[PDB]
């Protein structure tokens, strides 16, 4: 998952673990008419990288698994990514973090139970991969307080959009597209931060026509689905197409008051993947929200505090 130049024979360590893979109603809506309608199995994987006995950074991922007889639409959704900043960096984060999610991306060794008629599901070879990442400078996105810290690094909404799509172009080579939208924005104003990616283009990677509940997934915590939840709520989602939603989306508090608040996403088709047994810790979801819940309870400005939470977690090991 790491390369050996970075955890240095034991002085870096990684928490890593996924929850049990779970069915849940598809986050993007099917018309109960729609038939052939998939399965949905969602993993959700959090990292985190320690120096000795302190957090380093942090990353949250959604993996989502439409299955369908014979392929999987497969979502990959950038939930949370973080860094606490109470040590000089010694790392150039984005050589842990790309990675990370490229090992995330690529991971193919889910314990998918059967689906419930009203001991393991095999999953169709064919997979097409979505990549799904939002950049919204937010001081402490995992670590509560920690944007008081010395060595913790600020980027403006530009700095970091640049280097998210650094990061990504990284680790999406040879993709069928890379997509980036910045709701608001002009044509030129977008296109100057893709200029120097010959494969990037603007506009977005979901279905272009119809109503925008039928195209565009809903994902927790992201500044595209609160205004989704929006539409839905207020029942507007019978007319509302995805080109009026993006649009609309423009104008939303979150967007237009916001510091260059961006929208990636990036597709490859028709991947032919071959299901491998990786060992790793899975957790139930409760156990997962546990560990979430304690996190957030953490001053990470307060050495003391992150030093037991990490031994704590060792212990539960």
Same mark, same amino acid.
């Given at each position: 998952?790491?390369?050996? *130049?970075?955890?240095?024979?034991?002085?870096?360590?990684?928490?890593?673990?996924? &929850?049990?893979?779970?069915?849940?109603?598809?986050? !993007?809506?099917?018309?109960?008419?729609?038939?052939?309608?998939?399965?949905?199995?969602?993993?959700?994987?959090?990292?985190?990288?320690?120096?000795?006995?302190?957090?380093?950074? +942090?990353?949250?991922?959604?993996?989502? @698994?439409?299955?369908?007889?014979?392929?999987?639409?497969?979502?990959?959704?950038?939930?949370?990514?973080? &860094?606490?900043?109470?040590?000089?960096?010694?790392?150039?984060?984005?050589?842990?973090?790309?990675?990370? /999610?490229?090992?995330?991306?690529?991971?193919?060794?889910?314990? !998918?139970?059967?689906?419930? $008629?009203?001991?393991?599901? &095999? %999953?169709?070879?064919?997979?097409? %991969?979505?990549?799904?990442?939002?950049?919204?400078?937010?001081?402490?996105?995992?670590?509560?307080?920690?944007?008081?810290?010395?060595?913790?690094? @600020?980027?403006?909404?530009?700095? $970091? /959009?640049?280097?998210?799509?650094?990061?990504?172009?990284?680790?999406?080579? +040879?993709?069928?597209?890379?997509?980036? #939208?910045?709701? +608001?924005?002009?044509?030129?104003?977008?296109?100057?931060?893709?200029?120097?990616?010959? *494969?990037?283009?603007? +506009?977005?990677?979901?279905?272009?026509?119809?109503?925008?509940?039928?195209?565009?997934?809903?994902?927790?915590? *992201?500044?595209?689905?609160?205004?989704?939840? $929006?539409?839905?709520?207020?029942?507007?989602?019978?007319?509302?197409?995805?080109?009026?939603?993006?649009?609309? $989306?423009?104008?939303?508090?979150?967007? @237009?008051?916001?510091?260059?608040?961006?929208? !990636?996403?990036?597709?490859?088709?028709? @991947?032919?993947? &071959?299901?491998?047994?990786? %060992?790793?810790?899975?957790?139930?979801?409760?156990?997962?929200?546990?560990? #979430?819940? /304690?996190?957030?309870?953490?001053?990470?400005? *307060?050495?003391?505090?992150?030093?037991?939470?990490?031994?704590?977690?060792?212990?539960?090991?």
């Amino acid at each position: 998952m790491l390369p050996p *130049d970075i955890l240095q024979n034991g002085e870096f360590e990684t928490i890593y673990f996924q &929850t049990n893979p779970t069915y849940i109603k598809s986050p !993007i809506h099917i018309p109960k008419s729609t038939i052939g309608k998939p399965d949905t199995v969602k993993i959700r994987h959090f990292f985190a990288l320690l120096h000795q006995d302190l957090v380093v950074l +942090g990353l949250e991922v959604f993996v989502y @698994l439409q299955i369908y007889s014979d392929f999987v639409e497969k979502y990959v959704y950038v939930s949370k990514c973080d &860094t606490v900043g109470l040590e000089k960096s010694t790392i150039k984060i984005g050589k842990v973090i790309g990675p990370v /999610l490229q090992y995330i991306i690529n991971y193919n060794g889910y314990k !998918i139970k059967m689906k419930n $008629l009203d001991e393991y599901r &095999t %999953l169709p070879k064919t997979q097409n %991969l979505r990549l799904c990442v939002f950049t919204k400078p937010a001081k402490e996105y995992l670590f509560p307080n920690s944007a008081k810290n010395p060595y913790k690094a @600020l980027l403006n909404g530009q700095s $970091l /959009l640049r280097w998210w799509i650094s990061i990504i172009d990284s680790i999406t080579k +040879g993709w069928n597209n890379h997509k980036l #939208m910045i709701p +608001g924005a002009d044509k030129y104003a977008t296109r100057k931060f893709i200029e120097k990616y010959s *494969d990037w283009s603007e +506009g977005h990677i979901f279905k272009k026509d119809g109503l925008a509940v039928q195209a565009i997934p809903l994902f927790p915590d *992201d500044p595209k689905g609160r205004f989704l939840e $929006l539409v839905i709520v207020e029942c507007r989602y019978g007319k509302m197409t995805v080109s009026r939603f993006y649009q609309e $989306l423009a104008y939303r508090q979150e967007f @237009l008051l916001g510091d260059c608040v961006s929208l !990636i996403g990036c597709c490859k088709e028709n @991947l032919e993947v &071959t299901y491998h047994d990786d %060992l790793v810790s899975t957790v139930t979801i409760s156990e997962y929200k546990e560990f #979430m819940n /304690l996190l957030k309870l953490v001053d990470f400005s *307060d050495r003391v505090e992150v030093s037991n939470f990490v031994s704590n977690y060792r212990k539960s090991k």
